[PDB]
Amino acid sequence: STGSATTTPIDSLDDAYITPVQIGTPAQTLNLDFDTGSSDLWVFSSETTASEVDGQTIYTPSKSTTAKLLSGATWSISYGDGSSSSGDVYTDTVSVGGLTVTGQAVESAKKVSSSFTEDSTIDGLLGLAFSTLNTVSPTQQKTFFDNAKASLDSPVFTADLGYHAPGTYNFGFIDTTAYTGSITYTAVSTKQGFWEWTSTGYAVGSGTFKSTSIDGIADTGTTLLYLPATVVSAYWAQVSGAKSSSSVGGYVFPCSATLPSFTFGVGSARIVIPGDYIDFGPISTGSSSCFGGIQSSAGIGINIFGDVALKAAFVVFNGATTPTLGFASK
């Protein structure tokens, strides 16, 4: 089997991407944020505290003939940005782009934090990291990908995120028309439950490439590129007037600037992030100070290759017995 679904930016800044997902019988279609940095499939639901729902589409398990309460199971998750959600658990049929899993754990939110409530476009998350991070207790549950894997033509999924445009998540096959050149594969550590890999270095603009190992995670659910302070300082030093603002919470730059590209290494290969991808626009409406798309990971504890980096590439998440990650230009 295979599946293929279009993923669409939620706003003009590519702050996140949503992908339609069919849950239950008859299908209830919710727009979920596919997150390779977490391992819970959770949704706004008929059980979500009413004051915490503001425009989202909800899953109503009582209207699904295939829904079953997973008795005694609860879940609770926090994310790197301090947002959180929690609730109980159903199993139901879940389909993505024509690929169907029966008996998938669908985590129904009873509570969500304000950031989720305030984002009307995101109806929940679909985690695609390793199932060892799944938060369901007392019986940990598998991700959609792990459940699907044995049925897939090949045990892989791919992320092809667009810049200010739709893109694609494919399951079970590699679309050889979707990238240029060759895919370079690199080793993954699953020790922390993430798609964790080591970049071979970086360049700023047309500058020379610095060979240096940068350990980080491929995370479709994080908007920006978070790298060590040394690397980030070297980037922003090439933008006149750029500075780190403690009050704003990161590097800002004059909106009149033309940003340089940023290159990262994947083995001997190179992925180039165009300067435009690094512009996240005015810090507040009407401001001439713009927010940068490359920020320090110093306060986080891990480097994160988020959407800013990933959308410059065609990315293969290879879930073979020994997982690997592949990157191609496109």
Side-chain angles (χ1 to χ4, degrees), residues 1-62 64-67 69-109 112-141 143-148 150-190 192-242 244-301 303-330:
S1 64
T2 64
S4 182
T6 298
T7 193
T8 301
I10 64 165
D11 63 23
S12 68
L13 297 178
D14 298 346
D15 281 318
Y17 298 77
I18 50 173
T19 308
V21 177
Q22 282 71 48
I23 308 176
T25 309
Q28 300 179 40
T29 299
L30 275 64
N31 296 327
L32 304 187
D33 183 352
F34 283 23
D35 180 14
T36 63
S38 70
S39 306
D40 288 50
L41 193 176
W42 74 261
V43 296
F44 280 80
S45 77
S46 56
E47 302 179 328
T48 310
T49 299
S51 62
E52 296 179 350
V53 182
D54 190 3
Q56 296 81 10
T57 295
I58 62 167
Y59 169 58
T60 303
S62 65
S64 172
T65 60
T66 42
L69 180 71
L70 186 62
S71 182
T74 59
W75 63 279
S76 181
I77 193 162
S78 65
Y79 299 98
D81 65 339
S83 69
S84 64
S85 53
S86 63
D88 54 19
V89 187
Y90 293 82
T91 58
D92 209 340
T93 303
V94 172
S95 302
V96 176
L99 172 65
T100 301
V101 168
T102 58
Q104 174 63 45
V106 177
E107 303 173 34
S108 169
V112 304
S113 64
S114 61
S115 56
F116 287 113
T117 300
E118 290 161 4
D119 192 345
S120 66
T121 68
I122 291 175
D123 302 324
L125 266 65
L126 190 150
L128 293 168
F130 294 89
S131 293
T132 53
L133 293 180
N134 176 267
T135 77
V136 177
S137 178
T139 306
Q140 190 172 62
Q141 301 295 303
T143 71
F144 175 82
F145 178 54
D146 270 351
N147 281 323
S151 302
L152 295 178
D153 291 357
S154 179
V156 305
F157 68 91
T158 64
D160 181 7
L161 302 180
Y163 168 65
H164 295 174
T168 305
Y169 281 102
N170 289 331
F171 292 83
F173 72 105
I174 289 162
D175 181 355
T176 60
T177 74
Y179 57 87
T180 62
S182 49
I183 305 176
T184 297
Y185 289 87
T186 196
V188 164
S189 173
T190 64
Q192 295 190 84
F194 299 121
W195 292 91
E196 188 173 0
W197 65 290
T198 302
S199 173
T200 50
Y202 70 98
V204 175
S206 61
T208 65
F209 186 85
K210 175 72 171 183
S211 293
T212 184
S213 292
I214 305 171
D215 179 291
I217 67 166
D219 187 0
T220 59
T222 291
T223 313
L224 306 186
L225 174 53
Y226 294 90
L227 292 173
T230 47
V231 176
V232 175
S233 182
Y235 178 81
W236 289 109
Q238 298 304 310
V239 179
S240 292
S244 185
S245 168
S246 57
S247 59
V248 175
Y251 281 89
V252 296
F253 67 93
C255 295
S256 61
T258 302
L259 297 177
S261 64
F262 184 89
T263 300
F264 63 94
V266 181
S268 59
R270 307 288 180 253
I271 299 295
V272 179
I273 305 171
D276 289 344
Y277 290 26
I278 298 161
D279 177 19
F280 279 74
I283 59 172
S284 294
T285 302
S287 180
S288 73
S289 294
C290 277
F291 196 68
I294 294 178
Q295 297 293 345
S296 178
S297 64
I300 298 175
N303 301 305
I304 306 173
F305 294 87
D307 298 334
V308 166
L310 304 182
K311 75 195 183 179
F314 177 88
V315 188
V316 180
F317 295 79
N318 170 29
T321 301
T322 300
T324 65
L325 271 173
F327 291 83
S329 294
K330 67 186 184 192

